Amino acid sequence: EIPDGQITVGQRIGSGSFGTVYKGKWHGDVAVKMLNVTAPTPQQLQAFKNEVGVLRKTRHVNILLFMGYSTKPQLAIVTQWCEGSSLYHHLHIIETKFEMIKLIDIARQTAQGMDYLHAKSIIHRDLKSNNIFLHEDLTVKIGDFGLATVKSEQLSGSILWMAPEVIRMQDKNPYSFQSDVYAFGIVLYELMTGQLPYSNINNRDQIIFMVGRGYLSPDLSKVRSNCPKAMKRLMAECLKKKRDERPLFPQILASIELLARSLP
Amino acid sequence: DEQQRKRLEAFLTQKQKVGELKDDDFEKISELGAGNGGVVFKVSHKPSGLVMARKLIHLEIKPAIRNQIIRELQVLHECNSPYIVGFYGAFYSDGEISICMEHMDGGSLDQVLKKAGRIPEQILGKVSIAVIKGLTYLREKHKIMHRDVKPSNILVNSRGEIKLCDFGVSGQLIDSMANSFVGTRSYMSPERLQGTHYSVQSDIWSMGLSLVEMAVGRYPIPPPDAKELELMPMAIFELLDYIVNEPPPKLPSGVFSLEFQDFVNKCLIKNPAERADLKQLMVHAFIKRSDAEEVDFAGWLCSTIGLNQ
Numbered sequence: 226e227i228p229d230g231q232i233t234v235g236q237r238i239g240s241g242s243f244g245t246v247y248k249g250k251w252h253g254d255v256a257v258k259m260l261n262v263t264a265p266t267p268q269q270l271q272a273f274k275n276e277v278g279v280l281r282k283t284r285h286v287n288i289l290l291f292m293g294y295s296t297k298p299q300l301a302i303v304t305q306w307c308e309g310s311s312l313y314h315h316l317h318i319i320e321t322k323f324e325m326i327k328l329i330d331i332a333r334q335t336a337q338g339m340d341y342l343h344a345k346s347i348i349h350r351d352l353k354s355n356n357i358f359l360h361e362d363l364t365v366k367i368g369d370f371g372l373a374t375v376k377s378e379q380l381s382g383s384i385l386w387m388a389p390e391v392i393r394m395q396d397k398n399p400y401s402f403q404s405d406v407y408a409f410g411i412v413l414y415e416l417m418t419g420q421l422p423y424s425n426i427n428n429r430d431q432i433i434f435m436v437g438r439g440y441l442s443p444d445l446s447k448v449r450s451n452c453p454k455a456m457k458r459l460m461a462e463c464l465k466k467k468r469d470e471r472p473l474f475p476q477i478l479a480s481i482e483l484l485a486r487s488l489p
Numbered sequence: 490d491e492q493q494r495k496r497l498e499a500f501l502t503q504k505q506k507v508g509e510l511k512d513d514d515f516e517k518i519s520e521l522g523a524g525n526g527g528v529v530f531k532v533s534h535k536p537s538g539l540v541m542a543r544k545l546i547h548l549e550i551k552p553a554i555r556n557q558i559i560r561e562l563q564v565l566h567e568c569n570s571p572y573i574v575g576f577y578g579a580f581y582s583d584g585e586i587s588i589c590m591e592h593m594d595g596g597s598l599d600q601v602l603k604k605a606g607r608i609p610e611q612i613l614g615k616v617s618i619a620v621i622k623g624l625t626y627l628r629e630k631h632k633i634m635h636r637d638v639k640p641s642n643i644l645v646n647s648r649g650e651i652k653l654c655d656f657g658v659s660g661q662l663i664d665s666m667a668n669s670f671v672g673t674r675s676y677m678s679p680e681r682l683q684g685t686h687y688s689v690q691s692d693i694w695s696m697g698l699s700l701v702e703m704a705v706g707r708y709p710i711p712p713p714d715a716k717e718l719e720l721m722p723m724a725i726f727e728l729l730d731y732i733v734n735e736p737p738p739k740l741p742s743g744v745f746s747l748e749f750q751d752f753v754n755k756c757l758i759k760n761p762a763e764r765a766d767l768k769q770l771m772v773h774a775f776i777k778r779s780d781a782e783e784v785d786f787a788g789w790l791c792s793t794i795g796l797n798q
């Protein structure tokens with residue numbers, strides 16, 4: 226489970242909400258990520274060991290496999306490189322124009338991966354379009370899932386995909402299956418508007434406070450005109466402020482597939 | 490004043506000799522610190538020989554929007570003032586936006602505050618004057634707000650100078666920064682948090698909240714317990730709900746001037762309309778009390794870090 230200096234490290238790629246990733250060499254094309262958390266209390270390290278254990282086993286075609294963790298150079302995690310661009314890059318940097326069937330498809334495969342993860346009782350906890358890659362522009366690979374111990378509670382990264390209860394940080398643990406379902410709804414918002422939520426608000430603390438207290442939610446009028454009605458209803462169901470009202474991925478997958486059948 | 494005209498001009502001349510900024514022309518000297526999204530380095534510009542500070546922002550954004558940001562930062566070339574950090578240039582290269590500004594060997598008041606424990610009211614007087622004068626210059630002559638007033642945004646140097654930096658000249662930059670990089674605390678007015686735009690009122694609140702903190706050496710939301718006030722956390726949603734729902738911070742009873750307590754109180758009232766304005770603060774009694782005073786701010790700063798000047 227724990228490698229020891231065997232690994233090679235390469236070009237700096239960039240840094241996210243809980244680590245810095247570089248292209249590496251644990252074998253052909255691995256992707257290694259030095260975690261922000263670096264002084265692990267032994268109580269924290271134990272939970273990390275067991276979480277990596279649960280993560281080693283996860284194999285699914287819409288999921289990027291997690292290979293191991295190295296502590297000795299620096300506490301790092303190691304995962305497969307992904308030649309494709311992330312979904313955030315396609316939508317929001319290069320503005321890839323897709324047609325509705327492929328957007329629905331991307332939604333479907335994401336839902337397949339999330340349903341596999343919830344089937345194995347893994348809360349993603351960091352679902353963003355930043356963490357969905359389009360492999361060779363065809364398959365979907367979800368990454369950066371699990372690892373609850375490394376993310377410590379303070380928020381970090383982008384607020385945009387966090388549910389109200391995640392933003393409040395008032396429950397024992399606010400992250401649940403339905404938190405993932407909320408994040409996934411923001412990703413559906415992304416797919417169906419080509420746009421991030423709250424494009425009209427440039428005050429980050431305003432967004433945090435107002436979606437925290439249920440005063441602000443995505444503007445669903447900005448969904449594009451060829452968006453199926455069923456898809457828009459599903460989006461709205463995923464984004465309910467109260468977590469108990471959101472659906473679980475088994476019925477989300479059902480919904481999306483039965484939707485995708487009845488297309489032109 | 491005589492001396493602002495002198496020093497400002499000198500900056501403009503050795504800015505005239507800088508020319509066009511290119512990445513290969515900078516050598517890294519040392520690290521000045523990092524924020525939520527930016528990193529700052531003390532660098533040497535070889536063709537001119539100047540030493541400056543280079544902020545580097547790494548954003549994942551449409552190239553159209555990045556070129557918009559660069560165009561809008563170009564406005565900094567005309568925001569020249571003794572209360573505004575000197576600006577040399579801004580450009581894009583190797584995935585990074587670079588903002589080149591004059592180096593301030595005092596650093597920010599955020600760090601100074603860590604090194605001094607508390608900052609005396611005497612010194613906060615001169616600081617308040619510098620910030621009010623800067624916000625005023627921004628508003629009167631460029632119709633632009635700061636939008637991010639806080640001690641990490643107030644820079645000082647060993648020549649006694651106090652200057653503002655990181656003010657909102659590029660809205661695209663703000664809205665980019667908004668889509669990532671959560672922080673852990675906030676200096677955001679209660680009117681802005683609820684989506685109200687009452688202009689320059691937002692920056693006055695922020696300054697007030699700054700003052701309290703540097704006066705006591707603690708970010709004042711929430712107020713300290715009676716046992717922790719003796720010595721003279723919250724996730725960010727709780728902080729914001731506290732700023733919105735509960736009454737504003739306050740200075741301690743006797744340890745501070747009555748005029749200073751009144752100044753911060755008028756800065757911190759939660760109604761943006763009855764809160765003090767720039768022209769009112771400018772003539773507040775603590776402000777005149779402090780402008781009459783003759784302090785050795787350069788020497789005080791140096792004593793708080795290093796050698797006297």
Ligand SMILES: Nc1ncnc2c1ncn2[C@@H]1O[C@H](COP(=O)(O)OP(=O)(O)CP(=O)(O)O)[C@@H](O)[C@H]1O
Nearest residue numbers: 238239240241242243244246256305306307355369
């Ligand atoms: N297995 C992987 N393969 C290729 N690139 C990866 C990768 N994992 C991360 N990256 C890329 O490295 C850069 C930073 O990684 P990181 O995941 O930390 O940022 P991020 O935008 O995904 C926010 P988060 O930390 O919440 O996942 C990103 O550009 C990301 O797309």
Ligand SMILES: Nc1ncnc2c1ncn2[C@@H]1O[C@H](COP(=O)(O)OP(=O)(O)CP(=O)(O)O)[C@@H](O)[C@H]1O
Nearest residue numbers: 521522523524525527529542591592593596597641
């Ligand atoms: N012209 C300048 N001269 C000297 N030091 C500077 C400087 N500009 C910035 N710095 C230093 O870099 C540090 C970090 O700068 P930056 O503005 O990116 O983050 P910040 O400290 O303002 C917190 P945030 O990112 O939340 O706004 C500042 O505290 C300051 O000490």
Ligand SMILES: [Mg+2]
Nearest residue numbers: 241355356369
């Ligand atoms: Mg990621």
Ligand SMILES: [Mg+2]
Nearest residue numbers: 524641642655
């Ligand atoms: Mg700053």
